Amino acid sequence: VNSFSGYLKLTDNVYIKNADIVEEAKKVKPTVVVNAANVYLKHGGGVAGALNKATNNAMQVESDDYIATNGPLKVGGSCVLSGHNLAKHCLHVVGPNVNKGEDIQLLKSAYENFNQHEVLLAPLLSAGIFGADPIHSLRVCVDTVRTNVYLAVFDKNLYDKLVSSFL
């Protein structure tokens, strides 16, 4: 039993809700919140910009030190950093950005990072400003993640289309 509330159950291990991931994180304080990161951990917009703003830029400060030490992530890769005031940990995961020409097949590799954590609060990878089809992203999530994932979909209209079209 966990403290996630109001989710629809899609499969044994995947759940979905219309919610602002920032407000969800502040309420649940989950063990792991997933950020929709880029390889430079430049949290300028989308989910990343919103999460970073909620940390008063502490996420960006930590991220800049991470990059200065380790260099950029790989597309499809991840790193674990602090969750600041939002969660215990933040799993920064880089899904392919279609608006940069990146290979959509890497979306499965991106979701594989979730399997290293028993429970996560997460957005749909490569959705939003990353340019991929969110219906496809949900399908890859369900077919790749085996741990317990709670998906926050900010757009209510998008949420209803994902539920109604889910196979």
Ligand X SMILES: C[C@@H]1CCC[C@@](O)(CNc2ncnc3[nH]ccc23)C1
First CA to last CA distance, the chain? 26
The count of chain residues that interact with Cl ion, using the rule CB under 5 A, is 3
- Give yes or no for residue 20 binding ligand X (CB under 6 A): yes
Strand arrangement, sheet containing 148-153: 8-9, 14-18, 148-153, 119-122, 32-36, 89-93, 78-82
Q: Minimum CB separation from ligand X for residue 29, in Å?
A: 16
Cα dist from 133 to 8, 107, 119, whole Å: 20, 11, 24
Please report, as residue ranges, which positions from 143 to 162 form the binding site for ligand X (by CB under 6 A). 152-155, 158
CB-count exposure of residue 70 (10 Å: 0-12, 13-18, 19+): exposed
Chosen residue from 25, 28, 32, 46 binding ligand X by CB under 6 A: 46
Q: Are 4 and 150 in contact (CB under 8 A)?
A: yes
Please report, as residue ranges, which positions from 57 to 116 form the binding site for ligand X (by CB under 6 A). none
Q: Which stretch binds ligand X (CB under 6 A): 5-13, 77-85, 90-98, 124-132?
A: 124-132
What gap in Å lies between CA 56 and CA 87, rounded to an integer?
Answer: 14
Q: Which does 96 bind (CB under 5 to 8 A by kind): ligand X, Cl ion, none?
A: none
Q: Minimum CB separation from ligand X for residue 71, in Å?
A: 26
- Give yes or no for residue 138 binding ligand X (CB under 6 A): no
The tokens describing 97, both together, are 């950005």
Chosen residue from 41, 47, 87, 110 binding ligand X by CB under 6 A: 47
Chosen residue from 10, 19, 46, 87 binding Cl ion by CB under 5 A: 46
Q: Are 32 and 90 in contact (CB under 8 A)?
A: yes
Q: Minimum CB separation from ligand X for residue 122, in Å?
A: 9
> Which residues of the chain form contacts with ligand X (CB under 6 A)?
20-22, 46-47, 50, 123-124, 127-128, 134, 152-155, 158
